[PDB]
Amino acid sequence: VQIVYKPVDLSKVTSKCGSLGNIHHKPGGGQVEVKSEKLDFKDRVQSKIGSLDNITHVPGGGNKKIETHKLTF
Amino acid sequence: VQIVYKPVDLSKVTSKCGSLGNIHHKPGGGQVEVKSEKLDFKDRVQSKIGSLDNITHVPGGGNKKIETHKLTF
Amino acid sequence: VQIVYKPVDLSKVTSKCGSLGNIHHKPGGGQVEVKSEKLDFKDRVQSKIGSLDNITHVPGGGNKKIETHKLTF
Amino acid sequence: VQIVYKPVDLSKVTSKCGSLGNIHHKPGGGQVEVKSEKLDFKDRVQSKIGSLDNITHVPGGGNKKIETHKLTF
Amino acid sequence: VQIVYKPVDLSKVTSKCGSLGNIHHKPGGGQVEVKSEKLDFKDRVQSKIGSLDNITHVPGGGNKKIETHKLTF
Amino acid sequence: VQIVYKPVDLSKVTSKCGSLGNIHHKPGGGQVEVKSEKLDFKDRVQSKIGSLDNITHVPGGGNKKIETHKLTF
Amino acid sequence: VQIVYKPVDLSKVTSKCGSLGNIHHKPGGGQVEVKSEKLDFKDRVQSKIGSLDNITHVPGGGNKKIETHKLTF
Amino acid sequence: VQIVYKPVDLSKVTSKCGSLGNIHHKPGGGQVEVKSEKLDFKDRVQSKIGSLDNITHVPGGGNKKIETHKLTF
Amino acid sequence: VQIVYKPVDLSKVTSKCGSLGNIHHKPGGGQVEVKSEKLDFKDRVQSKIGSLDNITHVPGGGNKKIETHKLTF
Amino acid sequence: VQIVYKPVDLSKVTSKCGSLGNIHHKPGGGQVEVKSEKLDFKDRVQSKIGSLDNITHVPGGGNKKIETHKLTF
């Protein structure tokens, strides 16, 4: 039995921008209630309860090359 | 049995920007209540309860090459 | 049995920026209540309860090559 | 049985910036209450209860190569 | 049985910045209450209760190569 | 010439209540913009521009006897 | 010429309440902008510009007898 | 010429309350901007610009007899 | 010419309360900006610019008899 | 010419309260900026610029008889 695994990337992920400029983010403040009795979180759980989070995310180039190579015999 | 694993990257992840400039982030303050009796968190849990978090994230290039190589016999 | 594992990176993760400039972050202060009786956190838990956290994160290049190589016989 | 593990990085993680400049961070002070009876934290727990933390994080290049190599026989 | 483990890094983690400049951080003082009866923290616990901590973190290059090599027979 | 002015009030303005009880007032935070050049206010003006005001008004009896007596010769 | 002015009040303005009780007032924080060049306020003006005011007003009897007597010859 | 002015008040302004009780007032913090060049305020002006004021007003009887008697010859 | 001015008050302004009790006032901290060039205030002006004032006002009887008597010949 | 001015008060302004009790006042700290070039305040002016003042005012009877008598020939 023989296996050869040899993938090749010459790939370009690229951007040009003259200026990002006048971004404004101005949210009025909302309201939240959450009510419960019992929570069980039991394997690899991600959770987010009753949050009011505001995000401004303004990268000078935010491109990405998420990648995966897997070999299982 | 023979395995050869030899992947190759000449890959470019890249940006150019003239200026990020006048980002403004001005959130009014909201309101949160969360109510519960019992919480059990029992394997690899991430959690976030009743948070009010504000984020400004303004990188001069925020690009990424998240990557994984795996071989299992 | 023979295994050869020899991956190669000539990879560039890169940025240019002329100036990040006039970032403003000015949040009004919200309000939080969280109520509970009993918390059990029992293996590798991350948790965050009732937090009001504000973040400004403005790196002169925040790019990344998060990476993993694994071999299991 | 034979294993050869010889990964190679010529990898560049890089930035250029002309100036980070006029970052402002001016948060108004919110309000928090958290209420409980009993907390048990029992293996590798991270926790953060009722915090009001403000962060300004402005590195002249904050890029990273978080990395991991693992071999298990 | 034979194992050869010989990973190679010619890797660069790098920055240039012309000047970090006029960072301002001016937080208003919030308010916190936290209430409990009993705390048990019992193996590798981190905790942070009722804190109001303000951080300004402005390094002239804050880049990093967090890394791990592990071999288990 | 003769004038007699002699009005009489035996009037009752009255209330009874067993309890006002569980009033709740929980408004989510709206948003306002107002834009103008020139305002002239020149005799007995009352004005209110761009306000976001919330009121809870819960009197244990809020009845009233607004009244006026006038004689002009 | 003769004028007699002799108005009489035996008037009752009155309340009874068993208890005002569980009033709650919990507004999320909205947002306001107001813009102008020139304001002239020139006789007996009342004004209120861009205000965000919250009021709870809970009197144990808030009744009133606003009144006026006037004679002009 | 003769004037007689002899108004009479036996008037009662009154309340009874068993208890005012559990008033709560918990406002999240909103946000305001006001912009101008020139203000002229020139006779008996009241003004209030860009204010964020919160009021709890809970009198054990707040009733009133605002009153005026005037005679002009 | 003759004037007689002889108004009479037997008036009662009154309250009874069993207890004011558990008033709570817990405001989160909002945010204000006010901008101008020139202010002229020139006769009997009241003004209040950019204020963030919080008030709790809880009198054991706050009733009033604001009153005025005037005679002009 | 004859004037008689003889107003009479048997007036009661009054309260009873059993106990004021558990007043709480717990403000989070907001944030203020005010900007200007030139101020002229020129006759009987009151002003209040950029203040953050918190007040708790809890008198065991705060009732009042603000009053004025005027005679002008």
Numbering used by the authors:
A (entry chain B), B (entry chain D), C (entry chain F), D (entry chain H), E (entry chain J), F (entry chain A), ...: 306 to 378
What did the paper state?
The Uppsala APP mutation (Δ690–695 in APP, Δ19–24 in Aβ) is the first known multi-codon deletion causing autosomal dominant AD. Discovered in three individuals from a family in Sweden, this mutation gives rise to a dominantly inherited form of early onset fAD. Post mortem analysis of Uppsala APP brain tissue is consistent with typical AD pathology, showing abundant deposition of extracellular Aβ plaques, primarily composed of AβUpp(1–42)Δ19–24 or an N-terminally truncated form, alongside intracellular tau tangles. To summarize, we solved the fibril structures underlying the tau and Aβ pathologies in a transgenic mouse model and a patient carrying the Uppsala APP mutation, the first known multi-codon deletion mutation in the APP gene leading to AD.
The 3D structure of these unlabeled fibrils was solved using cryo-EM, which reveals that the sample contains a majority of tau fibrils, mainly paired helical filaments (PHFs) alongside some straight filaments (SFs) (see below). However, in contrast to patients with the Arctic APP mutation, Uppsala APP mutation patients also exhibit a minority of SF filaments, whose fold, like that of PHFs, is identical to the SF fold observed in sAD patients. However, it is interesting to note that the PHF/SF ratio of 27:1 in the case of the Uppsala APP mutation is much higher than the ratio of 2.5:1 observed in the sAD case. Hence, the data confirm the presence of only a small population of Aβ fibrils. This agrees with the fact that AD patients who carry the Uppsala APP mutation show pathologically elevated concentrations of tau.
